[model samples]
Target: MDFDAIIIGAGFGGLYSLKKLRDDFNLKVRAFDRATEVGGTWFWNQYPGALSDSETHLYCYSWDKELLQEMEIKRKYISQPDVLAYLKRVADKHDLRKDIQFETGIRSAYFDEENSFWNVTTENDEKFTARFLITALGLLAAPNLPKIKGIETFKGELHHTSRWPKDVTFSGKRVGVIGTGSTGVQVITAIASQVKHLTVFQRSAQYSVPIGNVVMSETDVAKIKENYDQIWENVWNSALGYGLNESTLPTMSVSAEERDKIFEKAWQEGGGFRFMFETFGDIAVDETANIEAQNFIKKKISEIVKDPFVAKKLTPTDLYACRPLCDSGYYEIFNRDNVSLEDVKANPIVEIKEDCVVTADGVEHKLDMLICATGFDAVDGSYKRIDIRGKDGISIKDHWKDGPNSYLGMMVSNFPNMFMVFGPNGPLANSPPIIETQVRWIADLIGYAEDHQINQIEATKDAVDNWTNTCSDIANKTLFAKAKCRNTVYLYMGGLKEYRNQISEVSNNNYKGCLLKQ
Candidate 1:
């Protein structure tokens, strides 16, 4: 075998896997990625103001204290460039880049059931084999460009926020950005002032909170780092594993005035996790509790924007239903003279003619550039995009046709010795922490196999069924799973603490669901 484990994608998951397999277990590990760099997501998503939703400090490796102490974190929210640079530094320091082959994408992977190894071929038709195959492919790696007529005929420059051109200047250009998700909001805010005229085409309205993004001093980082242990514990024990402190009070417990004051502080302080998880404990559960929070935000939106109609469109009532976005001046930008909001939900797009965008409402807007800020297919997509055939040539695509099924979101039933990092419905938390947790689990299982001289390990079919139910059962307990678009919300509804403890208990008692054979 060329390696003990063949890791795919060079993102946080792949980088972490390299260290674990090669250094910790002293196993031969080879990693590959489509992008020609170690930063993974950061390497490709170079759009202006592409920043981490998670806190800057928490995004980096928490295990390396010296690196943490030495590296200067520029902002509370690290921008894409800074993150990419930091990742490069990490790869260099660990010498992890040596075994990683850049610009190599896996075309297809075939499992040799008899030999107990994976036969993976690259896009260029090179072949390799490994005892264990791990996909560290990012949850949001695959970019989804909407299929529209004459997409190729755009005379002006067109860019997807995920695969933004590095050197393109937006200054004085008439830019049209579609999809008002988190990326759309970020792009609109960043380029609103720079562009000649900016048009934001929103399909769905979303809830957004002020980011309160701030620059940190050395002293501030030191203080934060000093209490890092407790902070991580707070994240570990909380519902959404991102915030440093969790609120102990319920929304309905405090007096109305007191509740108003608590929400006001969190609103001004900023961060979605801070607002939802660190302000009140009841908002995510009790419907009435969620209403007050939604009302408070709607009221703030009304106050911030000059136009009532615009304010109404931006204000979302489904507070706990959709993704909670944290932003810097996302709402306020709607009031700009050069900016326009097009609610595509009311008037859907008809076509992207030569140099203009035409909608069903018969309005045609000319643009010099188009920015598609549509998000990824997420957790389930990147993996499915790969042509993976398990035992007896059963395709992963057909396997997950109903939805992705796995034993504790790591190994699929038919795939032996193959594990996924941050798999679909894996853990609903801050991504870096979730990736770290999942990587440890994958590494642990591999180590367990080595220790026992076990050659093949596959999650049992019953285990996948039981775990899928376990995932849905935990999600069903929350308001997040009760959305009109339940499947969309279910992608990230599993409670972090519950999911973590569930695995911890089971794995300690012999990794109960996984089947290991010699």
Candidate 2:
């Protein structure tokens, strides 16, 4: 075999996986990324005001305690550039890039059934064989551009938030941005002050909270450094891994006045995840509890946006049940004289003219540039694009026709010796910690296989079905199931703490759900 394992996507998950598989186990592992460098998702998402929703302190690996102590994290949330730099530094520190092939992408990965090896071909036509295959394709890597008539006819500069060209600037240019997810909120907030006229074509209004991003003081940094031990402990034990106390009290369990005050306090403190998890525990589970929080945010939107008519357009009628979002003043962006709102849901986009966007109301919104902040196809999207075939030539696309299914979000039934990091049904919590969890587990599982002289390792079909059912059961109990998104069983809606326990117990019980062939 050319290598012990081949890792796809050199993002945080892949990078960490490579380090563990190589450094910890003394194995030959090669990592691949189509990007020019490391930092997979961060490498491409260079859009303006691109910030980590997770806090700086908690959004990092726990294994490198020394690195965590020494690194200078100045902001409450790290910016996109900062994240990229940090990843590069990690790559350099561990000398990980030597075994990594950048500017390279996998064309196909097929299981060599007889040899129990993975035969991989790169887009560059380079080929290799490895005993094991691991895909660390991040959840939000693949961008999904909506199909609009005459989309290609637009003459001006166009960009997706996921693939923003470095040289592109919106200064003094009339810009139209479509979609109001996390990326849209950040881009609009940052560019509104710079653009000549910014038109926001919101598909649906979002209930975003203030980020309350601030520079960390020396004292604050010192405190974090001092408490690194306890900090990591709390993060791993946490439900969302936010390192905050998730409220035990339900929304209605408190007095209306008390709930309002609690909500106000969380609003003042700021953070989207914190607001959802810290204020009340049942927002994701109970509808009545969810509405109280939703109503509060809607009321806040009314208070923040000066124009009532515009505010009405900005307020979301949907349950505040999608991905929790935080912005540096998203609502305030609409108050700007240069910024205007268009509810695409009411007056849908009819077509794209050569120089403007035609809405259903017969209004042509002129734009010098257009940005589609529409999000990715998510978890299973990247996998679908790759020609990955498991035992007996079963394609991954066929395996996931209904939806993506996995054994504890790591292994597939027929895919022997193949592992996934941040794959289907993974924990929908703070990513870095959960990523670290999966990487460590994968490394340990690989060690187990090697020590036992196992030639093949795959989860059984029954195991995959059981895990998928478990994920479905958990998701069904949450408001997320009713929110109407792609893949109802998309994530392991269970908290990080429970997820960690489940995975740990499985590994401890001699990889109970998986088949290990010697």
Candidate 3:
């Protein structure tokens, strides 16, 4: 059977895309996902203390105001199960189950230039065709497992945080956890007391804030409902897109005491991106401001963790350059007798035996389980996981070998009728809010195609070049796009408001350097 659109990966992106196309555009759209249900990343990542990084109230599909009022968010920050349930409710509320094919993983997809349709094949040998191809494939769906020697040799059960096995029983087991990113921080803090002994193998230190998670009172919900319009206006304007008010002050504009007050206020109030960007405007650009924030956090580290020597090793000299962590008792957990720290970068893991991890210092620490907390391969790598072929059988993998260059992070040159959510050069915001923006934009583009009876639409080379250059130029001005931290890092240095304006300007100017045809 044919479809007007075939959407991939039924996460928040795919769900909302399907709803927009089916309901508003009045098109036949089918969504598919590898998981047995909706909620792509949330469905799979079921580790202990798994929760939304964005504030729960704003971390949702902003398409319908009715949904916001009807939905009940138990906490200010939601756990994985809560997030999955919320997504499930969103799907069922829209009656989107029948439109989605669960547990169906795509093997390959190629554009049929002759017919102007996408020919998609599944691992199960099912076939589908569509005039428009939209990829809601998440930015972090793919996992990055570090290549330590003989990890395969370990007979004990191992799990990647992204691919956490359901019904895991880690209680009373000696666990060795790898990677100190957000996932590592959360897992360590949650399970340190539960496990027999938890050894955290760290590659680098992290600049972390506390999760000021709380349950929403009746008054809290009422206030948000009252201010929903004003809240989204702030979201639309800000870089983070979580209704955070951005600060205009440089760190040096204030005294050291004033700077401490600012940092301390954000620290006490607590948020992931809020404390970093909202505290000081020039933190990302000015090295002096960056160091000031870093030193303040170092002071925090000293006060939180009891062991001064351990705190020194855990202090992040890399500044707040990487993905900053927000945690519940991440630093304090290290003081527990059952928790131990392993500086794997200094003394790298030589090998993983069946029952132990062997460090370069030749010390062997026995473990019942190993958890790989290494994060996703970021924007390019997630999409590359699919074996996609474009014109002349040119593999998408090979095409992106240099780096991903897409116009608006949506349409690509030579790949007609294709759209990417959270693609390269997209707005630098949290996933759901960003997804709402991209999916709406894509739906509008599709509506235009339908209205004009257009069969094919693709990005132009000049357009792609211009967009890529714009992204790079903005990133180069900040500490974000340096060589050592290019592909692995998430986010564009250009804020979301500017990105939205860029897309709208292009559309207003006759869609700029993109092809549209009948």
Candidate 4:
């Protein structure tokens, strides 16, 4: 097979990339996914309580105003299945699937320096040589199974939230759920009422707020439709890219009483991390201000959970260190009689038995089913998982042993003609907005290739090094890399600090600065 460009993973990123490359650029583009259908993560993650964190209105494509205005789905938070259906609709409308190959995984991709093309081989023994390669592999697409002892020796049914078995039924079963991340929270809340008993093994507690999702009234829909373009522009200008209501005062300038009032209003409004934006300008950058916001959240948790002990256990000690969770009934689930919390920090899960999980403290909890809600490898996992060789057969994984590096988190040095959507250190926003930025950058690159009459373009070694360093510096200055925080997925397992230092040594926004100069 041959094409102008090839995209991996048919999720939101891949689908949008295909549409842009074909419709706008008028280039021959092919997309591949391991799944049997479109919707990369959504296709695989069909478990109970699977839904998007972003509001449905804001978390969609803005390329076509007609598409946005015409769609009638009015739910604030759409389910995974509905999201999948929407992607399928977009694909069909744009005739995107005609060029996409499903159920085929790219086993390896090697850049041919001489030809300036990518030699790609798939699991089915098919091969394609393309001028460009785009990896739209979503951040949370790759599921990571926890390193549990005797995982293979389990006698009963076992499932990871990301890879839920289709035929298995959990009704009336005593289930044990591990990890209390977003997925864990959702799954536990969903099955808590149905299961005979649900034991949640929590390593660290997440700061969660009610989603307060509501049906978009006809008036609300009409208002958005009337100013759809303005809404999208507003989202781009905003900090987090969800088109939040702006505040009049900055965090540092406000008095204590005023700051609390502002935070209270943000909480009452019920958007997840927008409260962080409302509290102060330097909340992420300043530890003192972050702690103030954290205390506010702790007070809320104390007020909600009836049990003082459980409330303390549920509240996070780390100061705004991790991303806040938005949910419909996450906290309320703790109130159920059948639901229980196991503090792994107090007593870690040592091993798994035929009917129970044994803690390090020698306590055993019996269960019929086990659900591992452990999250993904995040930004670097999927890219490193594949065997990608570039410029003299150098492995992409080895180059990123410390951390992933890329020019604008899209193209990496030495890896020519490769573009990544939702890649590392991208804009620090939600997936949809990040995808838009990536697609725009990619489209511009494609135009550059055509205009220069060059078949391929690779990032200069210096360019990638400088960008990586800048990203690292930005991260280190933020609370994300604080030395006091314990190892967790949100903190990159406590390696982010050192990793940022290393990236600082390599790259420092040189590429972007150069681009702006041009």
**TM-score ranking from best to worst?**
2, 3, 1, 4
What is the Cα-based TM-score of model 4? Answer: 0.90
Q: Write the per-residue lDDT of candidate 2 for residues 352-459, one digit (tens) a residue.
A: 988999999999999999999988885688898899998899999898888788899999888888999988788878889989999899999889888899888989
Stretch of 10 with least lDDT, candidate 3 = 482-491
lDDT of 4 by residue, 80-112 (tens): 888888888888888888898998999999999
User: Tens-digit lDDT track for model 1 on 417-440?
Assistant: 898887775776788777778888
**Poorly placed runs, candidate 2 (over 4 Å):** 140-146, 484-488
lDDT of 1 at 498: 74
lDDT of 2: 0.88
Better of 1 and 2 by TM-score: 2
lDDT for each residue of candidate 3 in 1-518, tens digit (9 for 90 to 100): 39999999888889998999999899998988888999988888898889788888888877788988887778888898888998999988889999999989888888998999999999998999999889988767546454778888889989988788777887889999998888889988888889999999998888899888888999988998888888888888777786777888888999988899999999987886877788988887887887887888899999988899889889975646445789988999989989889888898998988899999999999999999888877577767888777777787788788778788889778788999987776767877778888888998888888888899998987888887777777877886643234531234557788888888998888788988888
Steric clash pairs (candidate 1): none
Each prediction's Cα lDDT score? 0.82, 0.88, 0.83, 0.76
- Model 3 spans with C-alpha error above 4 angstroms: 140-146, 318-320, 481-491
Report the number of the highest-TM-score candidate: 2
Higher-ranked by lDDT: 2 or 3: 2
lDDT accuracy of residue 518 in candidate 2: 87
TM-score on alpha carbons, each prediction: 0.95, 0.98, 0.96, 0.90
